[PDB]
Design a protein around this ligand. Structure first.
Ligand SMILES: CCCCCCCCCCCCC/C=C/[C@@H](O)[C@H](CO)NC(=O)CCCCCCCCCCCCCCC
Ligand SMILES: Cc1cc(Cl)ccc1OCCNC(=O)c1cccs1
Ligand SMILES: Cc1cc(Cl)ccc1OCCNC(=O)c1cccs1
Ligand SMILES: CCCCCCCCCCCCCCCC
Ligand SMILES: CCCCCCCCCCCCCCCC
Ligand SMILES: CCCCCCCCCCCCCCCC
Ligand SMILES: CCCCCCCCCCCCCCCC
Ligand SMILES: CCCCCCCCCCCCCCCC
Ligand SMILES: CCCCCCCCCCCCCCCC
Ligand SMILES: CCCCCCCCCCCCCCCC
Ligand SMILES: [K+]
Ligand SMILES: [K+]
Ligand SMILES: [K+]
Ligand SMILES: [K+]
Ligand SMILES: [K+]
Lengths: 276, 282
């Protein structure tokens, strides 16, 4: 029965859908809980700054200030960040689906070329990202081969070592691809320890908020700083690519433990019910 | 044999790397060619607006005036309505917008228009995405499967209609691939674009632009459906959410198709180069 297999699939999809919808509701409340207060204090202090500017300076009134604000808002639409170097940056953001968006095409023509460029670029880059990831994955293979002959054969059996190996991949991976670049971002880019990691994650996950852009701030980079972040991204995006895939498998493993843990809990409702 | 193929793989990756390097170069030159002129005309006229306002009031704090703008821009990263008229203010972290924000996180669209300002929200965003992204991955795959089978039912209808005697199985696949694109761009691109134009006030190009930038998960943020306050009947926002679920599913397959074409154009060109080397000399 073909429609029976499809009923099993829609049952699976529909539950995950709710888990997602539920995951959204939970997060939506946690963010508002965290961000709501700062918005009020920050939005109240900005109000004190308008009232203080007209009081401190009789020179300016409400008639000139509103006209001023209208010009700054328009300045948001504009912002050279389209020079040879920044555009090459823009292209990278386009084909990686990071899209920080701080610099986006404002021309009807640039919008058309961006569309085409993206549709052709993103798949192209995917092949590269696949090879880079494959290379890095095999490099990792040579490393664990050296480690699997030292202290794998000794005490603990090989059945539980696969758990130890996965921890090594995360340890080093976090150090090289997260820790080191975050350290560098802090000093060079001036970002706090947290803001550094925040950038690393929101970037290598292709989220790309744009609130933190390494090399985006306008002042004083080193000669080879920008080229090194490019390489970090090519290899960084591949790392989270695997990491995100691993976390995915953790979920399909767990999803079963909870699904049978619910069958257990119902079971010992069942017989516990018949013994009464 | 094991290490032989390894040496062979690096050969392919290195060539693709260079192709990408060259692809970024050509792109960079094409964007700055398009965007550089308008950047200049806008940056010269803005200087005209600052000079026009400098001599306007001799009693201004001249040098400290440019410091004020720095404070406004620094405040623009977060939602700010700094105007005397209509002091009433709408929250961008309310229950409805924060829900949106989470959707942008787990879909890796990241419009960035509204991002966490708090050290706590940032630490939760990290955890949220790391677990959220992979989770939403399964959903998108499930919605990819469902939407796919519903298509397999539709083509099973047309494959017995146009089918006649003396037909080839390999050539009909090209027909199906076209109808997939056709109806796809209609429902998930054409239809939503038109709605975006009227309801959201966007131009026909800005709507398509938004769609492509969004459903490819690029997420500039320069255009966001439902961003401005306007009215939003509320028959609208829920739809957009659904469109996103399926629209992301659609491009996922579309983008994966283009990759197959590129791979194809890759072999034809690679043997076309072997042909040209074979003969070409004469
Ligand atoms: C942290 C912010 C978000 C919090 C996470 C909210 C998740 C709430 C969902 C709880 C899961 C129980 C719901 C019932 C599910 C069952 O009908 C079903 C099989 O019957 N199980 C699954 O689908 C498989 C369920 C797979 C569960 C995946 C979510 C696990 C996240 C655990 C959160 C730990 C974070 C701690 C900080 C590092
Ligand atoms: C942060 C980042 C993202 C990608 Cl997708 C690729 C490379 C990259 O490395 C930083 C260098 N940054 C620049 O070169 C800039 C020019 C104009 C503003 S920043
Ligand atoms: C473009 C987009 C992307 C995702 Cl991932 C999810 C939803 C979404 O748009 C739909 C409704 N929009 C809202 O509910 C808003 C609240 C505040 C600004 S928009
Ligand atoms: C590869 C696909 C290229 C086709 C994209 C053409 C976009 C036209 C927009 C017209 C407005
Ligand atoms: C899932 C893994 C969660 C790990 C949280 C690490 C948070 C690091 C934030 C940086 C603090 C300085
Ligand atoms: C940035 C540092 C990345 C180092 C990766 C080493 C790969 C060999
Ligand atoms: C031949 C292999 C080298 C690649 C040359 C073609 C590059 C096409 C770039 C198209 C940009 C749009
Ligand atoms: C497949 C790439 C997307 C193509 C979108 C075509 C929309 C053009 C509208 C013309 C009217
Ligand atoms: C997936 C469906 C989610 C629908 C959420 C609609 C939120 C509307 C806010 C107004
Ligand atoms: C416009 C087409 C852009 C695609 C460029 C051709 C692909 C060439 C790939 C050959 C190296 C593998
Ligand atoms: K993005
Ligand atoms: K963005
Ligand atoms: K993305
Ligand atoms: K992706
Ligand atoms: K983005």
């Amino acid at each position: 029965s073909d429609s029976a297999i499809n009923v099993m699939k829609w049952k699976t999809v529909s539950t995950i859908f709710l888990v997602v919808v539920l995951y959204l509701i939970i997060g939506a409340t946690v963010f508002k809980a965290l961000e709501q207060p700062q918005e009020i204090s920050q939005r109240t202090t900005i109000v004190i700054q308008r009232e203080k500017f007209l009081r401190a300076h009789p020179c300016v009134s409400d008639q000139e200030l509103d006209e001023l604000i209208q010009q700054i808002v328009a300045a948001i639409n504009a912002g050279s960040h389209w020079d040879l170097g920044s555009s090459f940056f823009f292209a990278g953001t386009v084909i990686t689906t990071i899209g920080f968006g701080n610099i986006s095409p404002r021309t009807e023509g640039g919008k058309i070329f961006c569309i085409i460029y993206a549709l052709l670029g993103i798949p192209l880059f995917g092949f590269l990202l696949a090879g880079v990831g494959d290379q890095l994955g095999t490099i990792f293979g040579k490393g664990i081969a050296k480690v699997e002959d030292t202290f794998i054969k000794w005490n603990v059996s090989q059945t539980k070592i696969r758990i130890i190996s996965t921890i090594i991949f995360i340890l080093f991976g976090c150090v090289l691809f997260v820790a080191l670049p975050a350290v560098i971002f802090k000093h060079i880019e001036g970002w706090s320890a947290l803001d550094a990691i925040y950038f690393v994650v929101i970037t290598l996950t292709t989220i790309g908020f744009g609130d933190y852009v390494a090399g985006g701030s306008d002042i004083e980079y080193l000669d080879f700083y920008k080229p090194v972040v490019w390489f970090w991204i090519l290899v960084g995006l591949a790392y989270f690519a695997a990491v995100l895939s691993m976390i995915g498998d953790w979920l399909r493993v767990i999803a079963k433990k909870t699904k049978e843990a619910v069958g257990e809990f119902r079971a010992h409702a069942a017989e516990w019910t018949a013994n009464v």
